[PDB]
Swiss-Prot record, chain A:
Function, in words: In muscle physiology, plays a central role in the balance between atrophy and hypertrophy. When recruited by MSTN, promotes atrophy response via phosphorylated SMAD2/4. MSTN decrease causes SMAD4 release and subsequent recruitment by the BMP pathway to promote hypertrophy via phosphorylated SMAD1/5/8. Acts synergistically with SMAD1 and YY1 in bone morphogenetic protein (BMP)-mediated cardiac-specific gene expression. Binds to SMAD binding elements (SBEs) (5'-GTCT/AGAC-3') within BMP response element (BMPRE) of cardiac activating regions.
Crosslink position(s): Glycyl lysine isopeptide (Lys-Gly) (interchain with G-Cter in ubiquitin): K166
Disease: Pancreatic cancer: A malignant neoplasm of the pancreas. Tumors can arise from both the exocrine and endocrine portions of the pancreas, but 95% of them develop from the exocrine portion, including the ductal epithelium, acinar cells, connective tissue, and lymphatic tissue.
Effect of mutating D38N: In a colorectal cancer sample; somatic mutation
Species name: Homo sapiens
Residue span, MH2 domain: 10-193
Family to which the UniProt record says this protein belongs: Belongs to the dwarfin/SMAD family.
Domain free text: The MH1 domain is required for DNA binding.
Whole-protein coverage range: 314 to 546 of 552
Localization per record: Cytoplasm; Nucleus
Protein name: Mothers against decapentaplegic homolog 4
Swiss-Prot record, chain B:
Name of protein: Mothers against decapentaplegic homolog 3
Disease: Colorectal cancer: A complex disease characterized by malignant lesions arising from the inner wall of the large intestine (the colon) and the rectum. Genetic alterations are often associated with progression from premalignant lesion (adenoma) to invasive adenocarcinoma. Risk factors for cancer of the colon and rectum include colon polyps, long-standing ulcerative colitis, and genetic family history.
Effect of S189D: Decreased activity
Gene that encodes the chain: SMAD3
Naturally occurring in which organism (per UniProt): Homo sapiens
Consequence of substituting S189A: Increased constitutive activity
Length: 193, 196, 198
């Protein structure tokens, strides 16, 4: 009656450059099942999140460089109430961090033109109660399940010069709203801490 | 309208986007609902450079604090199971202690954190003091709150920037009245150079 | 043509302070006062900075009525309403008079200046297609203008970087950026590749 479910936005995107968020968070309306995050420069929001138009004083020569290659970037599409798919429209690779992709430890490098599924709401939901049960592990541990991280161009992980995503010249952190909505529900059921 | 916006901080770092309150009664908690005009949920706000302490304290924010606009007065009710400290210059000056006074609000309690008429009257008599005296009233339109940990005298966290989880409130009504007076206070006397 | 013809971001030294402002009105002001809900006024006076020092706090008291930004036709002007000068660094403006693109123009109190011109930019965008992706990508800097309140920087001053000034803002011209985008989405890609390890 007074609200829920159905989120206004189906996700939020926060661009980064090393350990600093650059530009402001991009909110994608649920009415926009597919969003494109490219290195171009159209400021107008809508379906495109252009990283090429974000300024940063700290920015270096190494990053101006990498940013140059984001290109057509990727796309994030919402299929089932809370299921997210990725499609690398870039000439360069993309490094995704996904738990669903682990069930199937990451740096799941996505290849140009690839169209992969990166998140399963149900699997997420399940896995939450999974943590709430054993507790009956805090909100910052479990909110991770509702999050996706994705580095453009460079990579990290246990096999590159860069150990953590906070080292890539440019990346993004995606929060899936529905997954968080289910998480707000689960949280109310983990009796006092 | 928005009557107030709220900015969340973790130490001396600003975390998350500024929440704008459209509802006369809302809550700032540690949960994760993203689309609630009556719930500023801090749980869903990330911080890539977040420490264990911060992470640990976030867990005890629980139902957080409930802020609410009855008539021309603002109240803070501690829903969390841990206390919440409030530094309200408008609240302190009402019981006297050195504006910087942080006032603990134990679980299940609630305090009147701001009063309009009071402010308005403090704004009136300030016009007589001059520009500078009015410029500084912006502090009176701000209220700071820490969750779980306290600060100031009595705790060896002397500044808000020291606490792990706090939030600042800007009262738009008071700020708008202040703005109307300020655009009429003239200018500073004390000059300022372009090179120094 | 964009809802907001520009967005403005406030900074205090090398630190972003407050939220980004999106201009809807053809004429508006960035001042040091405290009105939080006016689509014509970006009020810096209410923005807080926990890490703010004396210099910044001292300069914010002199912003006053600030700068007035105008969008008349296909041009943008900046008027100094503040009882202290303002310094602008507009590549579009600077090139028009042939000054090292990093020239900072001083606008005294009461004065104003044409900081941007659309047709000029558009023409520069046209003859850039001929230089390659690189050349175009860098036309984003033409789409941004930086102003400092009260204290000047660059040549002529000791402060050589805008990040050295206590209070400054950065404008992004959406129209120009949008026109640029269209031509970027077609300029192909950079030839000199980029590893995944370097």
């Amino acid at each position: 009656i007074s609200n829920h479910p159905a989120p206004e936005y189906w996700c939020s995107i926060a661009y980064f450059e090393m350990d600093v968020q650059v530009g402001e968070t991009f909110k994608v309306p649920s009415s926009c099942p597919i969003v494109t995050v490219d290195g171009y420069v159209d400021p107008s929001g809508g379906d495109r999140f252009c990283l090429g138009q974000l300024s940063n004083v700290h920015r270096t020569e190494a990053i101006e460089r990498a940013r140059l290659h984001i290109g057509k970037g990727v796309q994030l599409e919402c299929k089932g109430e809370g299921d997210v798919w990725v499609r690398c429209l870039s000439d360069h690779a993309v490094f995704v961090q996904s738990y669903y992709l682990d069930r199937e430890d990451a740096v799941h490098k996505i290849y140009p033109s690839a169209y992969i599924k990166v998140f399963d709401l149900r699997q997420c939901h399940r896995q939450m109660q999974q943590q709430a049960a054993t507790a009956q592990i805090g909100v910052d541990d479990l909110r991770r399940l509702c999050i996706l991280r994705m580095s453009f161009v460079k990579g990290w992980g246990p096999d590159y010069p860069r150990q953590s995503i906070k080292e890539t010249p440019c990346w993004i952190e995606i929060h899936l709203h529905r997954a968080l909505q289910l998480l707000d529900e689960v949280l109310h059921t983990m009796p006092i801490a | 309208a928005f009557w107030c916006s709220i900015s969340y901080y973790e130490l001396n770092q600003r975390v998350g986007e500024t929440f704008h309150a459209s509802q006369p009664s809302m809550t700032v908690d540690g949960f994760t609902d993203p689309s609630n005009s009556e719930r500023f949920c801090l749980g869903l706000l990330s911080n890539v450079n977040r420490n264990a302490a911060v992470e640990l304290t976030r867990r005890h924010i629980g139902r957080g604090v409930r802020l609410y606009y009855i008539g021309g007065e603002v109240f803070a009710e501690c829903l969390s199971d841990s206390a919440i400290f409030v530094q309200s210059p408008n609240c302190n000056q009402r019981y006297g202690w050195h504006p910087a006074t942080v006032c603990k609000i134990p679980p299940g309690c609630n305090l009147k954190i701001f009063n309009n008429q009071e402010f308005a009257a403090l704004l009136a008599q300030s016009v007589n003091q001059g520009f500078e005296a009015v410029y500084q009233l912006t502090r009176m339109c701000t209220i700071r709150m820490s969750f779980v940990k306290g600060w100031g005298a009595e705790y060896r966290r002397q500044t808000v920037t020291s606490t792990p989880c706090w939030i600042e409130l800007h009262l738009n009504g008071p700020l708008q009245w202040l703005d109307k007076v300020l655009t009429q206070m003239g200018s500073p006397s004390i000059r300022c150079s372009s090179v120094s």
